[PDB]
Amino acid sequence: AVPYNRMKLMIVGNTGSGKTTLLQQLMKQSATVGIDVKDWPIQIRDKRKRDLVLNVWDFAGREEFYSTHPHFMTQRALYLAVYDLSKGQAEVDAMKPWLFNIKARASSSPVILVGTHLDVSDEKQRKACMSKITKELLNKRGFPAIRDYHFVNATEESDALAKLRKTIINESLNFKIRDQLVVGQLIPDCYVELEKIILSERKNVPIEFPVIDRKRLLQLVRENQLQLDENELPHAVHFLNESGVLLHFQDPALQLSDLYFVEPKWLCKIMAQILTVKGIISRRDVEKFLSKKRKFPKNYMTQYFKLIALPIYLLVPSSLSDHRPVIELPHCENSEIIIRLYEMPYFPMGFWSRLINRLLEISPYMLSGRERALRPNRRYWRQGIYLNWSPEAYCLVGSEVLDNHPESFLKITVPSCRKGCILLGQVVDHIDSLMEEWFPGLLEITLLKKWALYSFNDGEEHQKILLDDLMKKAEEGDLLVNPDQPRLTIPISQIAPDLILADLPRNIMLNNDELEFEQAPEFLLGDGSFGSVYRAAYEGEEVAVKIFNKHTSLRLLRQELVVLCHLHHPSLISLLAAGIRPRMLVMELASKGSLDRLLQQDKASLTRTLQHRIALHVADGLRYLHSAMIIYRDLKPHNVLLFTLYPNAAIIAKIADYGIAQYCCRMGIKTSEGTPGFRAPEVARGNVIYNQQADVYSFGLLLYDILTTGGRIVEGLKFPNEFDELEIQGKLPDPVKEYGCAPWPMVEKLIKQCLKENPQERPTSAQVFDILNSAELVCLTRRILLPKNVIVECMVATHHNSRNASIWLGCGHTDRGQLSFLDLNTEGYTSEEVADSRILCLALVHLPVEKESWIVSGTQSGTLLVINTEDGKKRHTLEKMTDSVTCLYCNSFQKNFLLVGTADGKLAIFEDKTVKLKGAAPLKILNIGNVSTPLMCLSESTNSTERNVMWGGCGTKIFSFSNDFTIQKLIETRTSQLFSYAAFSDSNIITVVVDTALYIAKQNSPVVEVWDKKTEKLCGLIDCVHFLREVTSYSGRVKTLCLQKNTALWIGTGGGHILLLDLSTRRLIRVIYNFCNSVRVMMTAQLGSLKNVMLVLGYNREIQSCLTVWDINLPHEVQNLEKHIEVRKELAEKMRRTSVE
Ligand SMILES: COc1cc(C(=O)N2CCC(N3CCN(C)CC3)CC2)ccc1Nc1ncc2c(n1)N(C)c1ccccc1C(=O)N2C
Ligand SMILES: Nc1nc2c(ncn2[C@@H]2O[C@H](COP(=O)(O)OP(=O)(O)O)[C@@H](O)[C@H]2O)c(=O)[nH]1
């Protein structure tokens, strides 16, 4: 819409050049600490161009501030350059580090070089050097687009600055980015409106910490609604970030997405305060760095911002000593040390701050923190480090300048011993890891040149050989021959030990005499990103040989070794040998192929148990990898190798193909390597830096593929373009609804929790394994939520085993009995008002004659509704009991009988064959108790098929009956022997289950009583709250009780807990919670030839009654899993211990 005449201006230069005083003359000064931001309203007299306003920055020239400048140096700018002329011609050459860094970070930027001090300096000498470098700049590929040059006088307003100012305004209008003019570019009016509110809020934002969260910005934009949207806001924020009026850091590694900085000048001043408030540091900085340090002003804001001080307690990169401290090496013999100079054209801006930060780990001899070695006598200075463990094991990474060489070096000074070779192997890997991630400009194709120093004889000249030439000589032979005479030779293991893989442990090395290998394309096991895998025999075994191709440097091979020869785990593949002469790695053999071959062509052996261990083992490997500061980035259902398809085994899954695995420290990673279709959203974009949590999204996609049995991969094979776009976006479909899989209610919760767009909301790899370690995650098949505000007190499962799996619910949320039909495989809920009063309990009666199926109902009024299961117009009521009906349990001795439990202790037996009559009479009305004692405790005996005695309970009494319909026992329960637990023993009985003894539950009774049927005495008193005391008047009731056949006892508490008691003697197997608020009804059902389901109905309290379906195999699963985890804990410790030893 309206033109946007805003441009950001940057002024760079070395200290003493006069960058600030130059700006002062144009806009018409002891030092420029930090960065000084200004506004420059300039009017273009020529034509009718809008009055330009320039956000001028005054980048400091003092060498201590150079570490944090590049982060505030971005595109959309017109960089100046100031060089002093009193120095002569060396000052122009001294600007070269400044010029190189500008082009590296700001590729499209019209740099103008501006001189100074014309009053007391010459120009002819400077012009000779200035013209030479710019002629050498157009053919350098590292310099910026220098398209001007000037010489400017002192602070007095002379004619020279008039030309300089005219140049800047002309250059800014001539500036073009993406073939479009930056100054005056068209822009939507909404973005300009957002700029206005930010400026207004900048004036009243707190000065101690100026920032607004996402909530504040959301509230402001909502009440304005200046033609904005919810998805156009990130575009608006990013555009304002480029201009320079709102700094937003959306990098997932930084975790600063929520915060919106509305004060760019404040952000560049914090670094100045830290510096000006060495070898020795004190606690003064963390205590009284500024007057804003207090309890509340330094609690919420301090957790938001971090900026290299690892907790110990402060060591900033800019306070280190300028010059190298005095040091003395144990020896200086030319044949006792190893030197690995890195000749580079220029030190990158902030290179040494990161390298010093990275090399502050202490585990070079026991990787992954297996054994924290002795703290070395570390020495600190601006460009270098001096880790020193022993007089025979030291490293001296540090800068060095040689005579007649304007370039910079990176001298390593490791010793020529076994511990010297180990250190050089790791230091070089970490240096190459930094320059691959953070400084790709140096590794651009060949600016960097790596030299290895060797000396045939001590005392002679210490010569140089380019390392790539040594690599070609190393592959043709293991010895170095002197061209002058072959009499004297030195090995390659003393010049470049890492070249010939001499730093690896002696346990793994290619003994090429017991290795029977055939490269013929018949023993082929697959392919890979950079190699091929072949079958082979190593020391009389079966191995998989990874052989690399011609287009592969040793850096690629070493990138795999750092994760393979240092980390040992049952879920990570391991090496047996590694050579360089044929350039192969010898790996373990996955017996039954990669997981992809199982998903597609073997969709018959994937049970719900095997799928869990595969997801568990991969998340187990990720937890170890992420705990060793290593990211994977290549998690696909191709790299998950299976060793055996047995649900109960020590090792099942395994992770391989560590081809693009690189270290991911607290600074994060920047490269975007990966496989299309399996990448996290942050990995898909190439403009952000992501942390290790980006790998969790990749695991979630793998877990998504496991659940759907590779449905997504097959669908994406037809349209690869949509495969990458949909996975990266995150609008993935619901798995159970579309692809047609068996429901898994709380791994779909895990998938939707670890696939969130915001990386901070994704669970850590250590938390995903904890969730997957839940033993109830395997045996919870289904979970249904009933409609809002329904109170169902009874249920029954239609058990014909072949007709239809359905649940019949008697609702009670209204004062009129509603009998509801629930279709389990469809989740179709329908109700029907059939009774005047609430229905208390239901029961299914099945007559084998004529295949008639009927269900009986019990109402509080007293009626007994009977309706056919299939026919909906077969209602016929029986004669009403004296009082309410509470239990209708039906079982056969022979003859099918329908026991009726009336609320006045009156059990009237009714004949199942008599249900067809529309109104009948009880066969024999037996009396157990009076009206005051309810009879609501019917049960049966499942032991030894003893369908003779049917133990029940009336009030606080125990009763029984047989086919003779006589009471064989009437046992009193009101009296308590201990006389202390009588309060919870003075309530009426609820439910009884019998296997060999009697288990008694009472209202509001946290105790369950075990009574022997032979001695009529309470054998045991199990206190439920005793078992809940470890996990927590109290919500520890016993509202339902179900007894599995011969394995365990399921006790359901009123607080939503489920107790699995080991039926052997006493043991508590497990306690289950965080899924329901009040368990009400529990029973065992069988559904669709898939038996062993324990229907648990509870209210998730607005009352949401949840009907979750478990497996009665759970008491075995909880014990099986913990033994399985315990075994893999021993293997993990054994493998790590033997490696570190
Ligand atoms: C017995 O071990 C495996 C067998 C199979 C497999 O089912 N076949 C079936 C038939 C097929 N060929 C038959 C003969 N010819 C016609 C060519 C085609 C290939 C082999 C597939 C994989 C097997 N095991 C295996 N272990 C370790 C790996 C790895 N893979 N490779 C290929 C890797 C793949 C991905 C990531 C890492 C690796 C890996 O590093 N290693 C060491
Ligand atoms: N470049 C320049 N500097 C001058 C001149 N006359 C005096 N100076 C001094 O140079 C200093 C310039 O400081 P400056 O380099 O801008 O500080 P910095 O931005 O922190 O490096 C001022 O403090 C002046 O006292 C002049 O003619 N040219």
Residue numbers in the entry: 1329 to 1356, 1365 to 1613, 1623 to 1652, 1658 to 1662, 1666 to 1798, 1806 to 2253, 2259 to 2397, 2409 to 2477, ...
Reproduce the article's own wording on this structure.
Leucine-rich repeat kinase 2 (LRRK2) is a highly pursued drug target for Parkinson’s disease (PD), which is the second most common neurodegenerative disease projected to affect 17.5 million people by 20401. LRRK2 is a 286-kDa protein containing seven domains (ARM, ANK, LRR, ROC, COR, KIN, and WD40) with kinase and GTPase activities. Autosomal dominant LRRK2 mutations with higher kinase activity are leading genetic causes of both familial and sporadic late-onset PD cases. Here we report high-resolution cryo-EM structures of LRRK2 in complex with a panel of small molecules, including two type I (LRRK2-IN-1 and GNE-7915) and three type II inhibitors (rebastinib, ponatinib, and GZD-824).
For type I inhibitors, we designed an LRRK2RCKW construct with M1732R mutation (LRRK2RCKWm) based on the following observations and rationales. Therefore, we introduced the M1732R mutation, which disrupts COR-B dimerization and LRRK2 filamentation, to prevent protein aggregation. Second, the binding of type I inhibitors could lead to a kinase-closed active-like conformation with flexible N-terminal ARM-ANK-LRR domains, which did not show interaction with the rest of the protein upon activation. We determined LRRK2RCKWm structures with LRRK2-IN-1 and GNE-7915 at overall resolutions of 3.5 and 3.8 Å, respectively. Despite small differences in the overall structures, LRRK2 KIN domains with type I inhibitors and ATP are almost identical with RMSD < 0.5 Å. LRRK2-IN-1 has an IC50 of 65.1 nM to LRRK2 and 1.27 mM to Roco4. Phe1107 and Phe1161 correspond to Leu1949 and Leu2001 in LRRK2, and side chains of both residues in LRRK2 point towards and interact with LRRK2-IN-1. Furthermore, the 1-methylpiperazine group of LRRK2-IN-1 makes more intensive interactions with the kinase N lobe of LRRK2, forming a more intensive and complementary interaction interface, which could, at least partially, contribute to another two orders of magnitude of IC50 difference between LRRK2 and Roco4 with F1107L and F1161L mutations. The cavity shaped by KIN and COR domains in the active-like LRRK2–LRRK2-IN-1 complex is sealed by KIN–COR interactions. This is accompanied with the opening of COR-A and COR-B subdomains, more intensive interactions between the KIN N lobe and COR-B, and a novel interface between the KIN C lobe and COR domain.
